[PDB]
Amino acid sequence: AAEIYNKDGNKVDLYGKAVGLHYFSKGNGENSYGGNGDMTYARLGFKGETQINSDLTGYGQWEYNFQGNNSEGADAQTGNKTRLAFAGLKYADVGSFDYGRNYGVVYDALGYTDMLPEFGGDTAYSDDFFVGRVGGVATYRNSNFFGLVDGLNFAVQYLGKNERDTARRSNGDGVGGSISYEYEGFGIVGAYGAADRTNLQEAQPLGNGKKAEQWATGLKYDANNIYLAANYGETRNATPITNKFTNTSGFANKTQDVLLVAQYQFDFGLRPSIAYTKSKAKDVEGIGDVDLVNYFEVGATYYFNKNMSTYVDYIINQIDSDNKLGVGSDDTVAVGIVYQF
Amino acid sequence: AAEIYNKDGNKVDLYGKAVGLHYFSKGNGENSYGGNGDMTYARLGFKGETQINSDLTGYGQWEYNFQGNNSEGADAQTGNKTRLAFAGLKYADVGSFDYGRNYGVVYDALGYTDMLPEFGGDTAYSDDFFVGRVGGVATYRNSNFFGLVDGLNFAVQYLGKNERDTARRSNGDGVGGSISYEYEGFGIVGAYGAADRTNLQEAQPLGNGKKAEQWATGLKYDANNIYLAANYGETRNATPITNKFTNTSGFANKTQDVLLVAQYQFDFGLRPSIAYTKSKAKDVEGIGDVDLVNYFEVGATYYFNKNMSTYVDYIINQIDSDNKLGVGSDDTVAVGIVYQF
Amino acid sequence: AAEIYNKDGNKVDLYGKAVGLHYFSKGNGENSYGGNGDMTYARLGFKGETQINSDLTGYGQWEYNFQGNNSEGADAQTGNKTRLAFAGLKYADVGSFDYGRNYGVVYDALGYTDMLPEFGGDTAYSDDFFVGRVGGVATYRNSNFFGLVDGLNFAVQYLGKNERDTARRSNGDGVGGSISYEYEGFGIVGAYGAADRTNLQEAQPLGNGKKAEQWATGLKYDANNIYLAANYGETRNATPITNKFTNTSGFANKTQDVLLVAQYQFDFGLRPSIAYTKSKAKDVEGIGDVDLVNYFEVGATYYFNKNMSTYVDYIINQIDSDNKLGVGSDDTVAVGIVYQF
Ligand SMILES: CCCCCCCCOCCOCCOCCO
Ligand SMILES: CCCCCCCCOCCOCCOCCO
Ligand SMILES: CCCCCCCCOCCOCCOCCO
Ligand SMILES: CCCCCCCCOCCOCCOCCO
Ligand SMILES: CCCCCCCCOCCOCCOCCO
Ligand SMILES: CCCCCCCCOCCOCCOCCO
Ligand SMILES: [Mg+2]
Ligand SMILES: [Mg+2]
Ligand SMILES: [Mg+2]
Ligand code: NA
Ligand code: NA
Ligand code: NA
């Protein structure tokens, strides 16, 4: 970001990017992984930190998504939203605490493989308990275990109920945590969270139970110009799904999720990527097992410098044309050009 | 704010804050003063001023509210809006003039008690003629009476008609003004404004008449680490109300409004607050007298520095369970953590 | 704008303005050129550029419109939108390429007369193929013809299909280009673009054909404190129209468009303006010829400096009261005060 202020212990960055982005899929993209057409968007945000005393810092962050693929007519606001808005306090060797809209603690694990040029991170749904950005989350984090164990971190998070007007975007009270260890270029992590479901969620035809659960483990290697990561995750009554045939909606009673990525960064800027993502629903009403996501990725980002890049991301979709939920089976390739600051 | 530009007589500040905020009320908060659940939000704005010559400055300001308690789904924009957008000119000892969306001149008085950690300021409704932020307002202000009387200020404001698609947010043409005097830590102020009502407003079942009127007086003391203030106000056909029982809506034929606040700022950061707010509707159709607001406040803000604070604000709601308009009778307590720049 | 960052070859400007703005027209403005009432708005944007090496720069830009004439109620978002969002690369003497939401290439011509204090530029519709801002546009530009011919520029633009939920805001694939030559204070330009229409567009009662076409030529003189410009343009199946009598909608089978402007900039700040704009629809179903726009403009901007200005813009509307499409026939005058940075 661009440091717009640095005095008296307070630093503030404005940050953002403009992403010229286009998806190419068969026909109207209706049956594809990512869709088709212009997908241009921009981001803007601020990130501030104040040194309160030697041991205490305060911080806050806000981040917004502005779609650049809408007309200036009545659809102008489609897909626009606040991504993050939180504030907190960090006290040396004791931990940090923040509250607001922020990443759910299971993303402490899922973030490991969420590194593809355009796609990937498919199981880190927004407004989905602990796996993505979510509102009303209070998060305690500790780095290097009170300063005693270098590389050992943990987090505990309280998720406050959000009774919204859709089952998809709602949640009940919940709690979760994570622990990670980093060592010589490697990181390993485990995260788990459980929460009440709301009545509206329970009322949906797909998915059954009073609690939602999510956990994931991850390994990454991030050194020597290589980035390699693997996630496994499982969820109960937590992953949102829709049956396009019956026009029903709800949550998968269970999923088993696998994500893999490998990338290499050449000195001259090129960063090729390959990945695999498979999210498998189980015990789905009227169906049993059904794939939600299943693809191989081949892509590349070319970095001109830390402000400018382009990329192509090809998704070789393995979902078949007779997927029992109606999941699209066609490939999608994204091409993007990115200015960021 | 953060000064992002200062050359050739032009200074521009970017400013903002991230407010992690949660309300706690009985049950679903449906019958409470403030509601219940996550209430996180962020603000962003700019404020600019150009020195045109020795005697003339130009200025402009824009300010936005981004809710942080919405999902990234279809409710993403709920409660998002521009709070201020105006530009003006100030000519030494003659006065300033600005036009756009800005505070109505009666807020020159009501601002005195609008100082609680989270709540308070209940009668300074937005889009309500002269008491809060409102669109299309042209405002002339004079400080120290043409430079002749230190501490003596006055304002005159023309309110342009806003025919909106709700009675609640509309207004006709109007005019108002205020005068204030500050002396040795004290301020006293009086403000009055009157405006035409629109046909849509006249058509509502609650409230009757062709003119809306609002006035308020205020005293404050702001010195020696103390802040104490009192407002009295009266309105005619101006305060918006709803009868939850009859599902009718409109404006109170009259209100009488009292707001009191007392705060003390300790050197180490703590700023306790106590307050009282009672807004009383009179001659309401089918009812006569009915309280709209009636509570005692006890709260505190802890300031770490000028960038970081936390607060708790407890509203001891005195509205009774049989309030004839259906006003909520339950208490609400807010807890907030704030980073601002 | 305000340069918020300048290190390592990357420069970023934050920019914006607050425009206090009011329109005055007969009655409710329903039958006027511009409407009536408060029209205050604000703009915010960023514009970045990174020097990648001696010959290569990357850049990005985002720009937003925040209306300041809405209430903070349910109409809060009306007329808010992203105006621009794109990123690109410029390689010395070879050209630049950008993609995202940007000006259609025919605006390379229409921009010449789009210089009035408040109005004007009437044929540069947004989301209208090549004449205004539009989504999904890939644009190649060359300055000084590969460095061989000073003042000679050209552009080629690919317009990607946007199938939106309104005919008005949609378009099919298209291509266009422009060429301009500047010399001794003068500029001349020609621009043309053609694109497929979508099925939804073809389905509208007004307008008939599979292709939309737009072209325009322009001359400007911009020197010696004078600004004078002329545009001529023609369109096929491209200009959006509505018959208020039949409540039908679509596109004009053809238009012929003329825009003229002349302005002079006095040293002390005053910049008077006169203009003429006439857009004439032809072969309109059930009507034949009908004027869409037809007015003379007289106005002035007073510049205090590069940050602060005021203006008045008077539109002498020549549309007659029996216009066969229901186009408003009444005058409109805008008064504005502008702070910008
Ligand atoms: C002390 C550190 C705490 C780390 C807790 C997590 C341990 C597991 O390592 C996760 C490696 O990824 C494995 C992905 O397959 C998952 C199958 O169960
Ligand atoms: C870290 C990730 C490791 C994964 C290895 C990636 C290999 C790329 O996969 C190529 C599979 O092509 C199969 C083509 O099927 C098309 C059927 O319609
Ligand atoms: C020369 C300065 C002009 C000030 C005009 C206002 C005078 C009144 O003082 C306001 C003090 O608050 C009293 C609150 O009770 C109101 C009851 O009427
Ligand atoms: C500047 C303000 C001066 C106001 C003094 C504030 C005193 C705090 O009020 C405490 C009242 O408690 C009454 C409890 O009733 C509960 C009934 O459900
Ligand atoms: C080599 C430079 C290329 C320029 C191509 C455009 C040439 C025409 O000049 C445009 C002057 O405005 C005339 C407006 O009337 C239009 C009537 O046809
Ligand atoms: C560069 C532009 C050159 C155009 C010259 C502008 C002259 C201003 O026009 C004055 C026309 O007034 C006609 C009044 O009709 C009113 C009927 O309701
Ligand atoms: Mg279950
Ligand atoms: Mg009355
Ligand atoms: Mg035709
Ligand atoms: Na169910
Ligand atoms: Na009435
Ligand atoms: Na047609």
PDB file of N, CA and C and ligand atoms in Angstrom, chain A residues 202-208, ligand 10:
ATOM      1  N   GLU A 202     -31.989 -24.478   9.298  1.00  0.00           N
ATOM      2  CA  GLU A 202     -32.580 -25.793   9.566  1.00  0.00           C
ATOM      3  C   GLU A 202     -33.789 -26.083   8.684  1.00  0.00           C
ATOM      4  N   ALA A 203     -34.503 -25.027   8.302  1.00  0.00           N
ATOM      5  CA  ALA A 203     -35.719 -25.166   7.508  1.00  0.00           C
ATOM      6  C   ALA A 203     -35.459 -25.506   6.041  1.00  0.00           C
ATOM      7  N   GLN A 204     -34.215 -25.385   5.582  1.00  0.00           N
ATOM      8  CA  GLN A 204     -33.927 -25.662   4.169  1.00  0.00           C
ATOM      9  C   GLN A 204     -34.004 -27.172   3.926  1.00  0.00           C
ATOM     10  N   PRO A 205     -34.426 -27.588   2.722  1.00  0.00           N
ATOM     11  CA  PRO A 205     -34.579 -29.025   2.447  1.00  0.00           C
ATOM     12  C   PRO A 205     -33.253 -29.790   2.444  1.00  0.00           C
ATOM     13  N   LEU A 206     -32.184 -29.166   1.958  1.00  0.00           N
ATOM     14  CA  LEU A 206     -30.872 -29.799   1.936  1.00  0.00           C
ATOM     15  C   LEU A 206     -30.099 -29.494   3.219  1.00  0.00           C
ATOM     16  N   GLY A 207     -29.573 -30.539   3.848  1.00  0.00           N
ATOM     17  CA  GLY A 207     -28.802 -30.385   5.067  1.00  0.00           C
ATOM     18  C   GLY A 207     -29.666 -30.571   6.296  1.00  0.00           C
ATOM     19  N   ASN A 208     -29.141 -31.267   7.295  1.00  0.00           N
ATOM     20  CA  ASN A 208     -29.937 -31.544   8.475  1.00  0.00           C
ATOM     21  C   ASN A 208     -29.106 -31.623   9.743  1.00  0.00           C
TER      22      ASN A 208
HETATM   23 NA    NA D  10     -33.138 -29.343   6.529  1.00  0.00          NA
END
